[PDB]
Design a protein around this motif. Structure first.
Motif, PDB file in Angstrom:
ATOM      1  N   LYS B 228       0.851  -1.182   0.000  1.00 24.12           N
ATOM      2  CA  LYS B 228       0.000   0.000   0.000  1.00 24.12           C
ATOM      3  C   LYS B 228       0.891   1.238   0.000  1.00 24.12           C
ATOM      4  O   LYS B 228       1.844   1.316   0.775  1.00 24.12           O
ATOM      5  N   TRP B 229       0.576   2.210  -0.850  1.00 25.10           N
ATOM      6  CA  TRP B 229       1.419   3.391  -0.983  1.00 25.10           C
ATOM      7  C   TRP B 229       0.895   4.483  -0.059  1.00 25.10           C
ATOM      8  O   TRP B 229      -0.315   4.690   0.046  1.00 25.10           O
ATOM      9  N   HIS B 230       1.806   5.181   0.610  1.00 22.42           N
ATOM     10  CA  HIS B 230       1.434   6.301   1.467  1.00 22.42           C
ATOM     11  C   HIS B 230       2.287   7.522   1.155  1.00 22.42           C
ATOM     12  O   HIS B 230       3.444   7.398   0.755  1.00 22.42           O
ATOM     13  N   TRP B 231       1.706   8.702   1.342  1.00 24.50           N
ATOM     14  CA  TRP B 231       2.465   9.941   1.292  1.00 24.50           C
ATOM     15  C   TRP B 231       2.218  10.647   2.612  1.00 24.50           C
ATOM     16  O   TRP B 231       1.085  11.002   2.923  1.00 24.50           O
ATOM     17  N   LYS B 232       3.272  10.842   3.394  1.00 25.18           N
ATOM     18  CA  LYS B 232       3.126  11.511   4.679  1.00 25.18           C
ATOM     19  C   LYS B 232       3.737  12.903   4.587  1.00 25.18           C
ATOM     20  O   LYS B 232       4.904  13.058   4.228  1.00 25.18           O
ATOM     21  N   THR B 233       2.940  13.915   4.921  1.00 24.26           N
ATOM     22  CA  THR B 233       3.328  15.305   4.703  1.00 24.26           C
ATOM     23  C   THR B 233       4.332  15.792   5.746  1.00 24.26           C
ATOM     24  O   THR B 233       4.171  15.562   6.942  1.00 24.26           O
ATOM     25  N   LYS B 234       5.381  16.450   5.271  1.00 19.87           N
ATOM     26  CA  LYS B 234       6.434  16.936   6.150  1.00 19.87           C
ATOM     27  C   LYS B 234       6.036  18.278   6.772  1.00 19.87           C
ATOM     28  O   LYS B 234       6.802  18.879   7.528  1.00 19.87           O
ATOM     29  N   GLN B 235       4.828  18.736   6.449  1.00 20.33           N
ATOM     30  CA  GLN B 235       4.335  20.024   6.924  1.00 20.33           C
ATOM     31  C   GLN B 235       3.204  19.833   7.929  1.00 20.33           C
ATOM     32  O   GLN B 235       2.772  20.782   8.584  1.00 20.33           O
ATOM     33  N   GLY B 236       2.731  18.597   8.043  1.00 19.77           N
ATOM     34  CA  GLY B 236       1.695  18.264   9.005  1.00 19.77           C
ATOM     35  C   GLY B 236       0.301  18.285   8.416  1.00 19.77           C
ATOM     36  O   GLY B 236       0.057  18.916   7.388  1.00 19.77           O
ATOM     37  N   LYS B 237      -0.623  17.605   9.082  1.00 20.53           N
ATOM     38  CA  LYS B 237      -1.993  17.509   8.603  1.00 20.53           C
ATOM     39  C   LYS B 237      -2.828  18.609   9.241  1.00 20.53           C
ATOM     40  O   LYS B 237      -2.838  18.763  10.463  1.00 20.53           O
ATOM     41  N   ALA B 238      -3.529  19.372   8.410  1.00 19.57           N
ATOM     42  CA  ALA B 238      -4.341  20.484   8.888  1.00 19.57           C
ATOM     43  C   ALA B 238      -5.632  20.599   8.089  1.00 19.57           C
ATOM     44  O   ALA B 238      -5.676  20.256   6.908  1.00 19.57           O
ATOM     45  N   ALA B 239      -6.683  21.080   8.745  1.00 20.48           N
ATOM     46  CA  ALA B 239      -7.984  21.210   8.106  1.00 20.48           C
ATOM     47  C   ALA B 239      -8.683  22.499   8.521  1.00 20.48           C
ATOM     48  O   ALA B 239      -8.319  23.123   9.515  1.00 20.48           O
ATOM     49  N   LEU B 240      -9.692  22.889   7.750  1.00 26.97           N
ATOM     50  CA  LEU B 240     -10.469  24.085   8.046  1.00 26.97           C
ATOM     51  C   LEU B 240     -11.743  23.710   8.792  1.00 26.97           C
ATOM     52  O   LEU B 240     -11.938  22.554   9.173  1.00 26.97           O
ATOM     53  N   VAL B 241     -12.609  24.696   8.994  1.00 26.00           N
ATOM     54  CA  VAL B 241     -13.931  24.451   9.550  1.00 26.00           C
ATOM     55  C   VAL B 241     -14.942  24.770   8.461  1.00 26.00           C
ATOM     56  O   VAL B 241     -14.687  25.618   7.607  1.00 26.00           O
ATOM     57  N   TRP B 242     -16.079  24.083   8.485  1.00 18.50           N
ATOM     58  CA  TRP B 242     -17.042  24.172   7.391  1.00 18.50           C
ATOM     59  C   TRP B 242     -17.559  25.592   7.164  1.00 18.50           C
ATOM     60  O   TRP B 242     -17.697  26.029   6.022  1.00 18.50           O
ATOM     61  N   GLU B 243     -17.843  26.307   8.249  1.00 17.89           N
ATOM     62  CA  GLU B 243     -18.322  27.683   8.148  1.00 17.89           C
ATOM     63  C   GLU B 243     -17.258  28.595   7.543  1.00 17.89           C
ATOM     64  O   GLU B 243     -17.579  29.563   6.853  1.00 17.89           O
ATOM     65  N   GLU B 244     -15.993  28.279   7.810  1.00 13.99           N
ATOM     66  CA  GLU B 244     -14.874  29.015   7.230  1.00 13.99           C
ATOM     67  C   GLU B 244     -14.754  28.712   5.741  1.00 13.99           C
ATOM     68  O   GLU B 244     -14.562  29.617   4.927  1.00 13.99           O
ATOM     69  N   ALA B 245     -14.861  27.433   5.398  1.00 12.31           N
ATOM     70  CA  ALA B 245     -14.684  26.975   4.024  1.00 12.31           C
ATOM     71  C   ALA B 245     -15.717  27.588   3.083  1.00 12.31           C
ATOM     72  O   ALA B 245     -15.397  27.946   1.949  1.00 12.31           O
ATOM     73  N   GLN B 246     -16.954  27.700   3.556  1.00 11.99           N
ATOM     74  CA  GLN B 246     -18.029  28.261   2.746  1.00 11.99           C
ATOM     75  C   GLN B 246     -17.729  29.710   2.375  1.00 11.99           C
ATOM     76  O   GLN B 246     -17.858  30.099   1.218  1.00 11.99           O
TER      77      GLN B 246
END
Ligand code: HEM
Ligand code: HEM
Ligand code: HEM
Lengths: 311, 680, 680
Positions: B228-246
């Motif tokens: 199984k192939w993986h790509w792990k980010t050297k910058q870290g995993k981050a996400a937004l919030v739905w109200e922000e994204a809209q």
């Protein structure tokens, strides 16, 4: 019940109450692929799979080079009179005469997925399916254009559209490339103002006027001509948003204008427009301080009042 | 050093040159050819027609899926000599470099859609190896909606807009999509991953990547391991919030693609580590699921990741269309040392990607395009075709032949380093249009994913499902969803049904469990670096506020951040105006000193910006979980909206105090204390 | 100097190399991937699908007209500095060399039709100049069927096969074509040229060439002269006879294209001289017709040809498709120093040729194809497009800009050596959909053409019309043809009407005349050289004939001829068999000594060839006007069919006497005494 889509009935396909078929006929099931064994590989002889996916793979056609983002509806045009004194056109040739139409409203710079509520010039394209052939008024919601020569259309559009390096920004004139053009080609200044007015951010398709923009000619059977300008005046009134509102709307609902047009018609409240014109004598082409063959100019109604021919 | 070196020979510089036709010769193209002053344009104006024709034909079809995306060039360096597991050339020696191109995308939107819509995201990498192009085409989510490729049209048709009105754009928030999710319970696993942070990443550089399918690595002796192939980010995993994204979808549709651009342009090239999971062929069905099931993933407790290398994206495209738009990835772009598996989803993809290129490029010769060309060389008996760019020297284009002396020659496992299917592979049984019974557990793993999320992240997924299923106009489909939701967790079915105004079904203990696995969460860990992250410094043109703000900027930038100084108008130090500014464009907001003037009184009402704008940026930034700050006297701004410096993620005091606090907060990135959880 | 020097960069050598996919990587492609030995083929066999897909998409549309053709590379050398008449770079200096490509064609047949069908022929030249590509797209006939381009579909639809059955292929011998010729009397002039020798040339190298339209030459100051383009063949004008061509269409469809190939390959590159007629702009309507009328030609007594240069075709293509097939000529490929005229036919062509490329090449970027690329360089703001091969450095792809600093710049008459329309040109009058009355004389010039032909050539034109109009099944159409023929000449109408079994209409002397012009005849002049011409020496494997035949060959070859030694089988000196031989492949037939044995008795009936084969080759060859010969006792062969050595074009005797005789006969090429003329 006139049903503008009556001609379109012949090509309607009803799949209700029927079994799955291939595009070449014959009954099938298309939820499992054909494999060699319990946990085997998929077989090249699974004609059902390839026929189904091929159509999916080829579902896409090119988006319009401009006015990519838009929506449309069918309608009927009724004439208010017998206008043979000015034009020999069949669809304007008798009072209460009905012609099927289709109209598509659009924005000029965005692609297929862009927001309806982006600041841009808007399109207002009408087709008349007359009994003497199709006649199209392809126009905007703004009576003037950026350029005076068509050969400059690639130059204008390239500038307003995203930068070729990163393809940024989408459906916006707020970048160096667009405003470089506006400053360097001063002809664009007039339409630019119309864009920065309320016209650049309408409330709905049903709340904007329409223009042929160009000066045309109406001809009678004897061959007598008048210079003409096409107008569409909304029976629902002109309304616009504010920029801070539009930006937030661009995110919460990209389909705002196209949904609004859908809902009104679906709710029995069909929108309506009146077709009005300005008539100019051929000797009066350069009378009003400009050439009437210039699309960066419009003719004030104090010089020539609008006459409605239909709705 | 430059990934785009092969692309140099086809670069065209129009600088210092005169206008030309496409067939050469110098021209002027600003006036049409007319007969008389105010005359008609002439048909013999070849310059006009040649210019316009190219413009009229500028458009090519958008991708059937993953239409909205962006990409960059890079280099992949191997960490070792992996001949013990694979015969692949690009992993065959330590410190060996391969040029790559990567394109990140969203699955359901068209060319103009917003980067910040909730969607699965694409992560497609090409390796331009010296044994041919090898493509890992994958998403930011390790699992897919369906287990058979023949259902791909059905899945995509539902999620994409309704065929009558083409509403809605780039959204799963409609009846058609949720009809599919409930009726095809296989979609439930990815559905949950979609409603988490994975559905709304902060950036392309802040998401992991997955091949999803099980593949095979093959050695020169022909021994295989499941992979199984993986790509792990050297910058870290981050996400937004739905109200922000809209809101972000409106203020900047190009948020992700610009961020990737800016990062590379500012010397901060993003990087990923390439990792794998190796499984013995006899253990394919060992771990509670079939490894040929793409709706399942293998927890790292059963098999940990081994990193084989790192890829860094250090170069931007020169032309988006020529490079990013025209590129054609295929899972069938495979090389020696790699092989496919009997994954019913993967098997179908191999057909689709190659066939779909005939639509987009209008020809069979699309691998002759500069961005599709391999670096290894192409020799075969393929001739003709639409837009054939080459002239072929060999006039004996058939095999076997006496006259060509056996060339081009035939290569295999033993001779010519040719590709070979794994020799141990077998086919046994009846020819069937069915799926294995090992594929019928659709609820266990979505629970496993839910169980391994922080309580707020769990709330996010549920809050997302509440939002989406609220848009369904058919009450019965919503009934159908709750039943499928219930089989995963009674709590979720209970919690979702509240927003929908329906009643929660009675518990089903059939698939319920409390197991947990690592690496599936985004927020619970802190970012390795705050580099490239953006701070918006709200200031003003009145007083000494600007100079105070300027000093704040230079200090912050030294630590690696990018600082934007916002004010009423474009003064000496002003990066952005208040009219053109929004909270979504910044990772943290900090009010400069003396800027209190614009949060109350006449200052908040200027002709230069919409009313309440500075107050909104702070309000939005705070309410969205971002670090907020005030410098010195600026604390009034924070209490203008009701924010005490005692809170978490909020910092007030002297400049040095604010800087240290904010930079600390950015490592946290998002403060989950500011979001309400059910039962509280 | 090898004109294909630019084409070297795109040449691919597969010699000494292993098989690859189109995306790279070494493969074997002779076996499919199957499930279980005698199993089904797997969808995951990427190698199979990629190979077959390219094969399945090998086809591009054939040209809408001039579909059947062949081409070669060459060099054009200027004889002088012609700035006195034109500002063209390729004619701007003495001994100046420009690369060219020329494609010869037939108008009505498709890709597979015969080269030796009766048709108008194409003669299209591209000049790869340093000021952009310039194309002279022309025929071997100086006049066209129609006077307006909007009537081009009507003409082509009529001549091409019937839409119900697609019959007949590459022929005007059907009702629809002659319906058009009679109903549109404008077509009559070219019709006569088609029925002459021009309709059946011996080779591409044996026909003149014409631009047909009147153009304009412009000097740097902007002074203009009306011009007509000519190509005069340095190999001489030669034609076949219809009965020969028909048999040739079967035995060798590739007769013309093979002949051009062999000539160049044998060091005998063909050459043409580029000549012009210069007419003062005020003399447009001077010479008895409108010079904007393409159904007219300008006699050399009114304006003699002045030669500006010579072009020689010395290079053959490496791949037919990439080079010959994909090349796209347009009359709109024009440069500085040339300009159009208000020829209604030419005006329409400018639209058509550019538009039709969108069909054949499926894209707007067909001038990026190597054979369409100029040598002068291309710089403009054209972007995107299907199959874009370039990457553009300038991100400001608009022309009125500050940011590109004015580049690419706008060029004109004074600056940048840019193209400009002739400054003296004007437009005067009403906008009209009509044609000038100066265009209404459709009968005078065909009369002039007929009058200027040798009596046998006149008979040929009539013999062609008799054959063609015989195939018309509608009696009234044939009546209509006689009416139009009568307006030209009563004698022609009389002579044709015999074959049709109709009655000759009463004379109409309105357009009758006895005027004559030069250069329009083919046979009345002798060939400048006999080089490249082919002689077939009929011999036998029995006795000493072969050695005798071999010695004859060695003698002939030094003079430039190409000799084929024919026998029962492939012995030591035998080039071809009797089974594989036919008279159509040879310019002259000569029977070797002792070969008489196969012209009678058992020798004429062998299993090694169809019965009567050697006797037919002599019979066909003699009856077709070719030089025929026998050596010594070989006289037995000639008197077997009734041919006395006393005759003209027949030579019998010693080898040395025969050789000199044949070579003399070849200059005459065709002996017109052997064809019967009407009245006798
Ligand atoms: C007054 C000036 C113009 C107006 C009112 C106008 C209006 C429009 C509108 C409303 C459409 C959308 C048609 C639809 O919705 O299907 C359109 C499309 C288009 N326009 Fe314009 N436009 C103008 C200028 C130009 C010029 C100067 C050119 C070229 C020289 C041009 C070329 C095109 C092209 C190629 C399309 C694509 C239509 C398709 O793909 O079907 N436009 N225009
Ligand atoms: C695990 C399952 C899947 C993954 C990881 C995946 C991923 C992707 C990605 C990342 C792209 C973007 C291409 C680009 O950026 O240029 C793409 C495109 C595409 N995919 Fe998928 N996808 C999956 C399922 C499928 C299936 C099941 C099919 C067909 C049966 C399919 C057909 C396509 C097609 C036709 C394209 C368009 C590519 C092009 O136009 O060149 N995908 N996919
Ligand atoms: C004096 C009149 C004409 C001459 C000398 C002429 C000559 C030729 C020749 C030699 C070709 C062959 C191109 C090649 O070898 O690659 C050709 C092709 C063609 N011609 Fe004409 N022709 C004439 C009339 C016309 C007219 C009136 C039209 C349209 C209104 C037309 C449209 C075309 C088209 C569409 C092709 C196909 C070229 C391609 O597909 O690349 N021609 N013509």
């Amino acid at each position: 019940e006139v049903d503008a889509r009556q001609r379109l009935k012949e090509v309607e396909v009803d799949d209700n109450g029927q079994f799955m078929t291939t595009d070449f006929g014959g009954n099938i099931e298309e939820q499992f692929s054909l494999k060699a064994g319990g946990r085997g590989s998929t077989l090249l002889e699974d004609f059902i799979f390839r026929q189904k996916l091929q159509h999916f793979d080829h579902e896409r056609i090119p988006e319009r080079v401009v006015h990519a983002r838009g929506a449309g509806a069918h309608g009927i045009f009724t004439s208010y009179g017998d206008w043979s004194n000015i034009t020999a056109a069949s669809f304007l040739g008798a009072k209460d005469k009905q012609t099927p139409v289709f109209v598509r409203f659009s924005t000029v710079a965005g692609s297929r997925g862009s927001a309806d509520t982006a600041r841009d010039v808007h399109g207002f394209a009408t087709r008349f399916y007359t009994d003497e052939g199709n006649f199209d008024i392809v126009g905007n919601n703004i009576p003037v254009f950026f350029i005076q020569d068509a050969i400059r259309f690639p130059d204008l559009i390239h500038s307003v559209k995203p930068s070729p390096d990163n393809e940024v920004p989408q459906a916006a004139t707020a970048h160096d490339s667009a405003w470089d053009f506006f400053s360097s080609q001063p002809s664009a200044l007039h339409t630019l103002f119309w864009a920065m007015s309320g016209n650049g951010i309408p409330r709905s398709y049903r709340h904007m006027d329409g223009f042929g923009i160009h000066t045309f000619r109406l001809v009678t059977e004897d061959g007598k001509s008048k210079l003409v300008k096409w107008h569409w005046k909304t029976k629902q009134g002109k309304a616009a948003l504010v920029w801070e509102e539009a930006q937030v709307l661009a995110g919460k609902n990209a389909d705002f204008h196209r949904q609004d047009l859908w809902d009104a018609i679906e709710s029995g409240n069909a929108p309506s427009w009146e077709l009005a014109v300005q008539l100019i004598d051929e000797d009066k082409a350069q009378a009003y301080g400009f050439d009437l063959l210039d699309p960066t100019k419009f003719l004030p109604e104090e010089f020539a009042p609008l006459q409605v021919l239909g709705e | 050093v430059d990934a785009r070196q092969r692309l140099k020979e086809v670069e065209v510089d129009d600088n210092g040159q005169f206008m030309t036709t496409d067939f050469g010769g110098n021209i002027e193209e600003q006036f049409s050819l007319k007969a008389g002053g105010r005359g008609s344009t002439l048909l013999e104006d070849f310059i006009f027609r040649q210019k316009l024709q190219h413009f009229d034909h500028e458009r090519i079809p958008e991708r059937v899926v993953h239409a909205r995306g962006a990409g960059a060039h890079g280099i992949f360096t191997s960490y070792g000599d992996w001949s013990n597991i694979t015969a692949a050339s690009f992993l065959g020696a330590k410190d060996k470099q391969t040029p790559v191109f990567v394109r990140f995308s969203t699955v359901a939107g068209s060319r103009g859609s917003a980067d910040t819509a909730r969607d699965v995201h694409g992560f497609a990498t090409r390796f331009y190896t010296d044994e041919g192009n090898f493509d890992i085409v994958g998403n930011n989510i390790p699992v897919f909606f369906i287990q058979d490729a023949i259902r791909f049209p059905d899945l995509i048709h539902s999620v994409k807009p309704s065929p009558d009105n083409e509403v809605p754009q780039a959204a799963t928030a409609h009846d058609s999509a949720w009809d599919f999710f409930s009726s095809q319970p296989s979609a439930l696993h990815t559905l949950f991953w979609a409603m988490s942070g994975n559905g709304i990443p902060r950036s392309y550089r802040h998401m992991d990547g997955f091949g999803i399918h099980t593949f095979r690595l093959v050695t020169e002796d022909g021994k295989s391991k499941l992979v199984k192939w993986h790509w792990k980010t050297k910058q870290g995993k981050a996400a937004l919030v739905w109200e922000e994204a809209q809101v972000l979808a409106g203020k900047n549709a190009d948020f992700h693609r610009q961020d990737l651009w800016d990062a590379i342009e500012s010397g901060n090239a993003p990087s990923w580590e390439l990792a794998v999971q190796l499984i013995d062929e006899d253990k394919a069905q060992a771990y509670g699921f079939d490894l040929l099931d793409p709706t399942k993933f293998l927890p790292e407790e059963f098999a940990p990741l081994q990193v084989l290398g790192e890829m860094t994206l250090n170069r931007n495209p020169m032309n988006y269309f020529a490079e990013t738009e025209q590129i054609s990835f295929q899972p069938g772009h495979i090389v020696r040392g790699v092989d496919f598996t009997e994954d019913p989803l993967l098997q179908g993809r191999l057909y689709s990607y190659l066939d779909t290129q005939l639509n987009r490029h209008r020809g069979p010769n699309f691998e002759q395009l500069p961005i599709n060309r391999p670096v290894s060389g192409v020799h075969n008996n393929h001739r003709d075709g639409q837009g054939q760019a080459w002239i072929h020297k060999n006039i004996h284009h058939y095999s076997p032949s006496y006259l060509n002396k056996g060339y081009p020659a035939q290569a295999n496992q033993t001779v010519g380093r040719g590709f070979f299917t794994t020799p141990g592979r077998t086919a046994s049984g009846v020819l069937n249009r069915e799926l294995s019974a090992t594929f019928d557990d659709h609820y266990t793993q979505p629970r496993l994913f839910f169980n391994s999320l922080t309580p707020v992240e769990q709330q996010f997924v549920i809050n997302a499902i509440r939002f989406e299923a609220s848009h369904v106009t058919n009450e019965q489909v919503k009934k159908n969803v709750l039943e499928q939701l219930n089989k995963i967790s009674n709590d979720v079915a209970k919690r979702v049904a509240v927003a929908l105004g329906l009643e929660a079904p009675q518990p089903d203990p059939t698939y319920y469990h409390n197991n947990v696995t690592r690496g599936v969460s985004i927020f619970n860990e802190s970012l390795p670096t705050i580099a490239t992250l953006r701070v918006g410094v709200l200031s003003t043109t009145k007083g000494g506020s600007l100079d105070k703000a300027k000093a704040l900027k230079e200090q912050l930038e030294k630590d690696g951040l990018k600082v934007t100084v916002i004010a009423e108008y474009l003064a000496s130090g002003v990066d952005q105006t208040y009219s053109a500014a929004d909270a979504t464009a910044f990772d943290a907001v900090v009010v400069a000193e003396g800027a209190e003037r614009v949060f109350s009184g006449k200052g908040a009402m200027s002709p230069l910006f919409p009313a309440g704008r500075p107050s909104q940026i702070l309000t939005d930034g705070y309410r969205w979980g971002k670090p907020v700050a005030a410098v010195g006297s600026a604390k009034k701004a924070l209490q203008s909206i009701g924010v005490e410096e005692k809170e978490a993620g909020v910092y007030a005091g002297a400049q040095d105090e604010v800087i240290k606090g904010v930079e600390e907060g950015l490592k946290v990135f998002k403060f989950l204390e500011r979001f309400a959880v059910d039962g509280d």
